[PDB]
């Protein structure tokens, strides 16, 4: 039982060299979504704004598949995120290193998919002038891979709406919109596409 | 002697691989309980408040047990928390990563049960507006597992009154109420429950 979970965790990670990242020949799709919970700080003296959110990532590796009855009918398991490869999905316009606010544990399932939603706090670039008006401001921050083009890592959203069903009521900022938009860019030089999800939120001071 | 202790610690940890966490085949019950020492700071400008507390946590594994009459009449021992599986209980509305203020050492008693009480400082989302009076504010934090549902980790509390017998006398706030109440919950979609201990504190400046 726990026998089988232990032996399966010992049937994917030692006996297999860790995965070397996706390539143009074996690309990888990474579906990404946001779950926003507060706008903790704003700083018009420097135009940092701090968000607290959940960043949900999901991808699929064949080096992680198994046969469920060959291991006690185990459909899925939880594991520390350090045990597995994870994509380098990061914020293009941060101003401080991200702080991690939660454990970093992932679920790997018998077909071989990880899902991993850690809680973070991000300082990024935004002009807040207008927070107190009745239009608010509009900030944006882009999120993409840092070394992989659209030919190695494809980015995806399962919705354009940022899950707000858990935004802190008594926050000091009301959210008017919360968008998460896959955007494909090309460059004059290069055939391969570069992907990102633009996370733009319009928001207001509490009135 | 301490040589007996050293052998017991070796037999448990050295040739038996570590617990891979609970499955619903073999679920786990984890009891919580806070011991609040101080409300250190409110920030009326960001809507965060900082608590120093103790998180007592208990659980029980058939793998951490042994027969004392084979290890020199040893009832129990103390060990670094890094040497054992520890549950992933987490504040869902934290704002800055939690700071540990104590050693992380657990007591394993011979029936496989475990207790473990780190000291922590936590920053979470809370409106302090109205902490310039008497009736006071209340705000709350839900603690719960990050990847485990009620079919895996059954959360629980013994008492539902936060222990206040060691709160700081001269603290710049003082507490009126302080409860730790378990909450179960389901989602329209999904059969498994989702548990969380809700910690809620009514407090106000000293007079």
């Amino acid at each position: 039982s726990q026998a089988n979970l232990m032996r399966l965790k010992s049937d994917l990670f030692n006996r297999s060299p860790m995965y070397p990242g996706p390539t143009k020949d074996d690309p990888l799709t990474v579906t990404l979504g946001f779950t926003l919970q507060d706008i903790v700080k704003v700083d018009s003296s420097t135009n940092e704004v701090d968000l607290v959110y959940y960043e949900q990532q999901r991808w699929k590796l064949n080096s992680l598949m198994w046969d469920p009855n060959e291991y006690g009918n185990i459909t899925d398991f939880r594991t520390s995120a350090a045990d597995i490869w994870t994509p380098d999905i990061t914020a293009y316009s941060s101003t401080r290193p991200v702080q991690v606010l939660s454990p970093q544990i992932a679920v790997v399932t018998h077909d071989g998919s990880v899902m991993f939603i850690p809680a973070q706090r991000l300082s990024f670039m935004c002009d807040p002038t207008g927070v107190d008006s009745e239009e608010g401001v509009t900030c944006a921050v882009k999120f993409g891979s840092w070394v992989y083009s659209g030919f190695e890592i494809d980015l995806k959203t399962d919705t354009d709406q940022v899950d707000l069903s858990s935004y802190y009521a008594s926050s000091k900022y009301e959210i008017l919109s919360a968008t998460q938009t896959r955007q494909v860019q090309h460059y004059s030089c290069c055939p391969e596409p570069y992907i990102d999800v633009n996370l733009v939120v319009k928001f207001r001071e509490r009135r | 002697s301490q040589a007996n202790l050293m052998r017991l610690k070796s037999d448990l940890f050295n040739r038996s691989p570590m617990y891979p966490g609970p499955t619903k085949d073999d679920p786990l019950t984890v009891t919580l309980g806070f011991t609040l020492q101080d409300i250190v700071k409110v920030d009326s400008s960001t809507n965060e408040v900082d608590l120093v507390y103790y998180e007592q946590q208990r659980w029980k594994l058939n793998s951490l047990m042994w027969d004392p009459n084979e290890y020199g009449n040893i009832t129990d021992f103390r060990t670094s928390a890094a040497d054992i599986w520890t549950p992933d209980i987490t504040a869902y509305s934290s704002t800055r990563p939690v700071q540990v203020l104590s050693p992380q050492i657990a007591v394993v008693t011979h029936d496989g049960s475990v207790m473990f009480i780190p000291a922590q400082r936590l920053s979470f989302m809370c409106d302090p507006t109205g902490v310039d009076s008497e009736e006071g504010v209340t705000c709350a934090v839900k603690f719960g597992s990050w990847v485990y549902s009620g079919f895996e980790i059954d959360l629980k509390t013994d008492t539902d009154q936060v222990d206040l017998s060691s709160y700081y006398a001269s603290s710049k706030y003082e507490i009126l109420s302080a409860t730790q109440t378990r909450q179960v919950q389901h989602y329209s979609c999904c059969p498994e429950p989702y548990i969380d201990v809700n910690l809620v504190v009514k407090f106000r400046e000293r007079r």
Binding site: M115, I117, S166 | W146, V147, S149, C189, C190, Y194
Partner: peptide, 16 residues
């Protein structure tokens, strides 16, 4: 309304 909560968000990719 699950995806707002991490343990179920990872339990239910189909929904989230």
């Amino acid at each position: 309304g699950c995806c707002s909560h991490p343990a179920c968000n990872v339990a239910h990719p189909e929904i989230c």
